[PDB]
């Protein structure tokens, strides 16, 4: 298939939608690692493997300020925390488990919400 919708339709509609995916992600039993900032100064690899590290510790603060109230806008930083953290974290030891679960659970919401449209 080939369509790539990713249309949030209404901005406000996304505000509470991303708040929905996040609200369950913030209280997720595996989002603990995503609730903190990396080093951004002594963390080798970033600024190269982690284009947009991001993290609920600082990202969740935007949903309150409507800094990511759209399609890829919010999914970019969130999907980034999942795809960039896995770009280095073990393929399945301690970090992958969270990025795997969170990426799996929030999917049903962003997919039904109209974020992944896949």
């Amino acid at each position: 298939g080939s369509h790539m919708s990713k249309e949030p339709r209404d901005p406000d509609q996304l505000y509470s939608t991303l708040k929905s995916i996040l609200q369950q992600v913030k209280s997720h039993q595996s989002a603990w690692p995503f609730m903190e900032p990396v080093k951004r100064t002594e963390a080798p690899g970033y600024y190269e493997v982690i284009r947009f590290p991001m993290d609920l510790k600082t990202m969740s603060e935007r949903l309150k300020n409507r800094y990511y109230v759209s399609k890829k806008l919010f999914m970019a930083d969130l999907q980034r925390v999942f795809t960039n953290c896995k770009e280095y974290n073990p393929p399945e030891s301690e970090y992958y488990k969270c990025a795997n679960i969170l990426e799996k659970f929030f999917f049903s919401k962003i997919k039904e919400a109209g974020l992944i449209d896949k």
Binding site: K39, E42, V49, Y88
Partner: peptide, 11 residues
């Protein structure tokens, strides 16, 4: 070498 995710490098 790749990401790090460790303690704070004390310089």
């Amino acid at each position: 070498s790749y990401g790090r995710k460790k303690r704070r490098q004390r310089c």
